[PDB]
Design a binder for this molecule. Structure first.
Ligand code: AMP
Ligand code: MG
Ligand code: MG
Length: 200
């Protein structure tokens, strides 16, 4: 069946961008915080959270970071820091109705890095608690591997290739990466896939 019933009322698509450099900067810090709220059955985008984030440990974006992500210094200057952005997320979650225990939602990311490594690592560095809703997620690469029977080599680009989808927007823009996740999910649901939590 195409677009079967799903286990969640909403899927929350997230794909950070972070400071970076060649070789890699340390520590990395989140600079773009997107969440797309997808209707759980149709995978259509119903709401968007989007904030750029001001880094503090390495406050000046490197040339490599701006080239990779397209994020220029003026986009992070004057922004709230991660601590405040996380409070804005909680407020957005509340207004969207996602803190009701009987509304079931789950984050979806391309890989485990965002919520297994990046967010808890920075929150630990800053001494910040991680909200419980960030502690479960679906790794789209793993979901795709069950839906298609194969392991994608390079993330969103190869999942779009395998599904004959045109890429949306710019790779390594957090919000555009989220739109591609959402488009891949919609196609997997069209083919009949029922999404499941993959995080441990
Ligand atoms: N090729 C790369 N070299 C160095 N850092 C990278 C690279 N690709 C991604 N990153 C880092 O990982 C973050 C998330 O990657 P992505 O979602 O692919 O844009 C980026 O914002 C960078 O901080
Ligand atoms: Mg990513
Ligand atoms: Mg990204």
């Amino acid at each position: 069946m195409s677009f079967p019933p799903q286990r969640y009322h909403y899927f929350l698509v997230l794909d950070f961008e972070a400071t970076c450099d060649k070789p890699q900067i340390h520590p990395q810090e989140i600079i773009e915080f997107p969440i797309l709220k997808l209707n759980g059955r149709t995978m259509e985008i119903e709401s968007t959270f989007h904030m750029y984030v001001q880094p503090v440990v390495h406050p000046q974006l490197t040339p490599f970071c701006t080239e990779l992500t397209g994020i220029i210094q003026a986009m992070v200057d004057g922004q709230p820091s991660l601590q405040q952005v996380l409070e804005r997320v909680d407020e957005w979650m509340a207004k969207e109705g996602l803190l009701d225990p009987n509304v079931k939602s789950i984050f979806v990311t391309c890989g485990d890095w965002d919520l297994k490594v990046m967010l808890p690592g920075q929150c630990q560095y800053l001494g910040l608690p991680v909200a419980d809703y960030f502690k479960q997620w679906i790794n789209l690469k793993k979901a795709y591997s069950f839906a298609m029977g194969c392991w994608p080599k390079n993330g969103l680009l190869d999942m779009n290739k395998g599904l004959s989808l045109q890429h949306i927007g710019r790779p390594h823009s957090g919000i555009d990466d989220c739109k591609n996740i959402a488009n891949i999910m919609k196609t997997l649901a069209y083919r009949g896939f029922i999404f499941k939590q993959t995080s441990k």
